[PDB]
């Protein structure tokens, strides 16, 4: 046979031709994949079987036969490729942003819209607050509160000084949390700080140069949380554009808009300059975050630019 | 520079036959005269004549039995870059003896037929068909 009896297992990480699979016993192994399988990402739950463990005193590659149906999944549309998933069976995403690499009220909004379409509970963290001066901290908090004023969990943590992680640790316990965000924001460093993994094994960490940082982590790897649950390190991303999502799904994604649906005199209210747009005046009096409204409009107009492709995303 | 007059004469004949000329003219030579005599004897060329004394010129009258060139193939075999000498027994045969190979033997310039009938080997000047 040259292989052991089949068993259930999780996908700790995917590396092209072959992935890393953890058995229920908790031992991880490199395992190949059958060509019949089409999609297989981190967090997937698969039926696999290891090879007979006698070769050069080390383990031989296992084979993964099939994957179980995903419960949840985090996907992202890719030009030339369609929508592709990053990690499945996820319970919570943590949008990791940092002031130095880039400050983007636009990427955070795109992520919020996405996770709202995916029903996954989000949480905003802002890394490297050590770089900002105390005045600058008071200058970043009065717009980080934009989201905590609509309930979003907003935390500020310094990975280098391990400052204020402790609430992040608490929010991370006993759940499955994918660390997502732009490259250089500190997702790997934050994981090193939180996991407290052995010094011999650490995620790659290169410093940013000029306008933007490198793409160090090119993989998505699961990690077992010390207290309880699991986190997932993800590769940095540049554009989280949303052309696959329908335009209405973007209005739904902004949670501060349900307070004004059906209050626009024109029923098909595009809400930009159409008369009687409730959210227009709502943002006129400051009920809505101006930046959020402008971001909504600009991502809508961005969808027009990226609708040029005739490929399908269904 | 001109480093082989015999190949020049051959190609003059060839291009004259192709361009359907009536008569060609080379700067004459004793050797050129002898080769022309062979092709007149073999009915390859109708006639040849030498004019002038200080700068003599040889003139050849090309044949055309059906308007098509009588000499349909002609090529220099022993060139200055590589000389070719054959012994009497291994003398060549052009078109299996239908054509004529001109060879310079110790007894002058003669057709392969005359040469091997005289039992003499020599430098193969060229093949005329």
């Amino acid at each position: 046979n040259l292989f052991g009896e089949p068993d259930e297992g999780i996908v700790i990480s995917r590396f092209g031709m072959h992935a890393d699979v953890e058995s229920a016993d908790g031992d991880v192994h490199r395992c190949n994949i059958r060509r019949t399988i089409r999609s297989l990402v981190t967090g997937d739950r698969v039926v696999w079987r290891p090879g007979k463990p006698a070769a050069e005193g080390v383990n031989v590659k296992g084979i993964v036969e099939a994957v179980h149906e995903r419960t949840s999944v985090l996907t992202r549309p890719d030009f030339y490729d369609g929508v592709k998933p990053i990690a499945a069976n996820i319970d919570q995403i943590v949008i990791v942003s940092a002031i130095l690499p880039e400050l983007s009220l636009n990427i955070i909004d795109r992520y919020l819209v996405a996770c709202e379409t995916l029903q996954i509970e989000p949480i905003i963290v802002l890394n490297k607050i050590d770089l900002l001066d105390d005045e600058g901290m008071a200058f970043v908090n009065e717009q980080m509160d934009i989201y905590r004023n609509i309930g979003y969990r907003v935390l500020m943590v310094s990975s280098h000084t391990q400052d204020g992680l402790k609430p992040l640790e608490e929010a991370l316990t006993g759940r499955i949390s994918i660390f997502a965000g732009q490259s250089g924001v500190g997702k790997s460093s934050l994981l090193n700080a939180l996991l407290g993994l052995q010094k011999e094994i650490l995620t790659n960490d290169i410093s940013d140069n000029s306008g933007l940082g490198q793409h160090t982590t090119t993989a998505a790897r699961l990690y077992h949380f010390p207290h309880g649950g699991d986190v997932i390190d993800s590769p940095g991303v540049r554009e989280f554009g949303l052309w696959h999502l329908e335009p209405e799904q973007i209005t739904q994604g902004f949670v501060e808009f349900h307070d004004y649906l059906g209050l626009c005199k024109y029923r098909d209210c595009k809400h930009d300059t159409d008369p009687g747009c409730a959210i227009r005046e709502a943002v006129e009096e400051g009920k809505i975050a101006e930046t959020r409204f402008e971001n909504y409009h600009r991502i809508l107009e961005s969808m027009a630019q990226v609708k040029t492709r005739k490929n399908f995303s269904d | 520079s001109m480093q082989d007059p015999i190949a020049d004469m051959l190609t003059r004949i060839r291009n004259g036959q192709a361009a359907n000329k009536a008569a060609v003219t080379m700067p004459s030579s004793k050797l050129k005269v002898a080769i022309a005599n062979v092709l007149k004897e073999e009915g390859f060329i109708e006639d040849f004549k030498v004019e002038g004394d200080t700068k003599p010129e040889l003139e050849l009258t090309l044949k055309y039995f059906q308007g098509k060139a009588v000499v349909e193939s002609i090529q220099r075999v022993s060139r200055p870059g590589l000389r070719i000498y054959k012994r009497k027994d291994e003398l060549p045969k052009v078109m299996a003896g239908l054509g004529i190979a001109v060879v310079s033997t110790s007894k002058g310039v003669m057709t392969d037929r005359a040469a091997r009938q005289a039992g003499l080997g020599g430098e193969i000047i060229c093949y005329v068909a």
Partner: protein, 123 residues
């Protein structure tokens, strides 16, 4: 081109590169399996090829294919390899002689038995 050029330097023919250098023109060689592992083929083909990396007697180390369904090969196995080429296995240019002094024949093989070291069934 010119005969003079050929004289100044003659035409050098093209010597052939042997596609089985580890054989040293020997029809077969003997080695010991240092590692048995499963590999993947080229894009047209999908499979778990059973191959073994073998340290040869003449100091050479090469990867060899194992024909037939199943093998009893493990680490420290004295096998005999033969020349050949596997198209879909890049870098595998040797087979294993099924039935050669460590590797047994294929079980219940009935046709082309000689190609797998399977003695004639008693009948």
């Amino acid at each position: 081109a010119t005969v003079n050029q050929l004289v100044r330097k003659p035409r050098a023919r093209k010597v052939a590169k042997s596609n089985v250098p580890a054989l040293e023109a020997c029809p077969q060689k003997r080695g010991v399996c240092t590692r048995v592992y499963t590999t993947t083929p080229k894009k047209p083909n999908s499979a778990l090829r059973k191959v073994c990396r073998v340290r040869l007697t003449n100091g050479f180390e090469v990867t060899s294919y194992i024909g037939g369904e199943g093998h009893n090969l493990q680490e420290h196995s004295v096998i005999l390899i033969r020349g050949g080429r596997v198209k879909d296995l890049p870098g595998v240019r040797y087979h294993t002689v099924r039935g050669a002094l460590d590797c047994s024949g294929v079980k219940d093989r009935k046709q082309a038995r000689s190609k797998y070291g399977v003695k004639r069934p008693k009948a």
